[PDB]
Amino acid sequence: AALRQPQVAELLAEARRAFREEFGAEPELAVSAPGRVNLIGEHTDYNQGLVLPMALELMTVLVGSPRKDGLVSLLTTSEGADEPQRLQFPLPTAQRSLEPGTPRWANYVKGVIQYYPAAPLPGFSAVVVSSVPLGGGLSSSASLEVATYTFLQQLCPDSGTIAARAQVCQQAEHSFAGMPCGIMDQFISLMGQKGHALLIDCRSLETSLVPLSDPKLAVLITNSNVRHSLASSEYPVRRRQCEEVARALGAASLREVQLEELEAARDLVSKEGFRRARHVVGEIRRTAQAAAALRRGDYRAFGRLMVESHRSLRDDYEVSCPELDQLVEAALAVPGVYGSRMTGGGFGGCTVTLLEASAAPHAMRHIQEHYGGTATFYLSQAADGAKVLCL
Ligand SMILES: O=C1CCCC2=C1C1(CCCCC1)N=C(Nc1nc3ccccc3o1)N2
Ligand SMILES: Cc1ccc(C)c(OC(=O)c2ccncc2)c1
Numbered sequence: 001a002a003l004r005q006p007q008v009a010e011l012l013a014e015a016r017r018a019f020r021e022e023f024g025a026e027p028e029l030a031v032s033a034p035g036r037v038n039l040i041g042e043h044t045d046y047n048q049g050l051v052l053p054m055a056l057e058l059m060t061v062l063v064g065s066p067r068k069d070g071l072v073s074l075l076t077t078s079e080g081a082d083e084p085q086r087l088q089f090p091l092p093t094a095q096r097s098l099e100p101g102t103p104r105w106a107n108y109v110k111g112v113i114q115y116y117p118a119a120p121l122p123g124f125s126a127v128v129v130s131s132v133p134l135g136g137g138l139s140s141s142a143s144l145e146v147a148t149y150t151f152l153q154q155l156c157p158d159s160g161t162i163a164a165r166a167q168v169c170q171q172a173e174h175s176f177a178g179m180p181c182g183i184m185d186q187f188i189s190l191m192g193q194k195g196h197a198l199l200i201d202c203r204s205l206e207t208s209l210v211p212l213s214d215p216k217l218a219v220l221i222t223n224s225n226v227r228h229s230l231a232s233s234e235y236p237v238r239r240r241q242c243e244e245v246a247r248a249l250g251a252a253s254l255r256e257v258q259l260e261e262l263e264a265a266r267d268l269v270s271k272e273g274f275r276r277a278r279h280v281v282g283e284i285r286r287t288a289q290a291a292a293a294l295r296r297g298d299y300r301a302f303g304r305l306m307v308e309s310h311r312s313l314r315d316d317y318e319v320s321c322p323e324l325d326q327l328v329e330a331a332l333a334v335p336g337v338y339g340s341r342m343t344g345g346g347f348g349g350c351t352v353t354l355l356e357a358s359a360a361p362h363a364m365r366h367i368q369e370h371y372g373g374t375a376t377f378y379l380s381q382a383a384d385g386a387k388v389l390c391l
């Protein structure tokens, strides 16, 4: 009974009802954008590396209608949202630009509106709902940024590219939520497809849609139900650390750097600096193998790379925590688990376990009553990206 069921028809239903009640009318548009689990490729995106996320059935829905009066009126019904649940503001102009503040959940919608590249953007009324656990490491913020962006395209079609929309959503994250993220979470929330993982090349911005085509197996996502303080603080520190190496090795990005390179050039960089880049340059290689493992149906190599990916995160990148360490070591003990790791930024959030669909229900007995803290489970079919339903 720890396993949360998606209930996506219900989430749209609740969003419509709450719109009709709040604004006096049926909403004209529904949009959705999913949260994400990163199978492997941790802390590689911002080092121009490779990531292998898939989109979750956990999503953010905006239901809404254009206004004439050039203002934005928002209601969120998400339980975890900080108060107030409602915010109204005028559209930004040459004169007045939006600014982050209170409430925080609105900062994501403001940021996307502030950097939306097309015109003219009319005002709108919208209800915001999400089944993505808020700050639980499955990209609630990217799904609300991308759900917002998708709603704005219905108001004012952009004439742009998938990467342009990801960088808009990424800019809102940087400027309005003070989180200097890579492109992974936005890219996956835009481009996900049911029954596929998405290999992203964060140097070239090439993307591959890789079938998840053994249904014998599952990905179990485990919510540790913690966020440590160091989370917010440490993500940029790591990022600045990766960039100092790249300075010192005359590389424009760590991507360009290979493990033979870094071992021969230690003297050039810090002992921390060398171990930060040892993850990244290590990780990027492990992903490329994990992609090529997935296509060959080599579940057991992908598994083992995954554990390497955790051990590099835990020991070299130091962005795991005892709770994650303990959900991973606990998963890796269960026969038919190919692999387990922390996913996303770390310091709390979720693990992702690759295992047999028959073995998965053994785990949720076991994890719940052999996990120090409280487990929540998602059994994730790989899902669609950003979607529109005309109402
Ligand atoms: O405070 C933090 C720390 C950083 C991680 C982060 C949280 C909070 C920020 C604002 C409210 C409190 C939780 N929210 C999100 N994301 C998000 N808030 C949403 C609201 C409605 C719909 C979808 C949403 O996704 N991320
Ligand atoms: C990394 C990897 C390698 C191989 C396989 C078969 C993988 O899993 C799926 O194909 C799959 C996952 C979840 N739901 C359905 C299918 C994953």
Ligand SMILES: OC[C@H]1O[C@@H](O)[C@H](O)[C@@H](O)[C@H]1O
Pocket (backbone or CB within 6 Å): 038, 041, 042, 043, 044, 045, 046, 181, 182, 183, 184, 185, 344, 345, 346
């Ligand atoms: O794999 C680490 C990831 O951490 C995420 O939470 C962040 O939003 C991504 O851009 C990426 O840096």
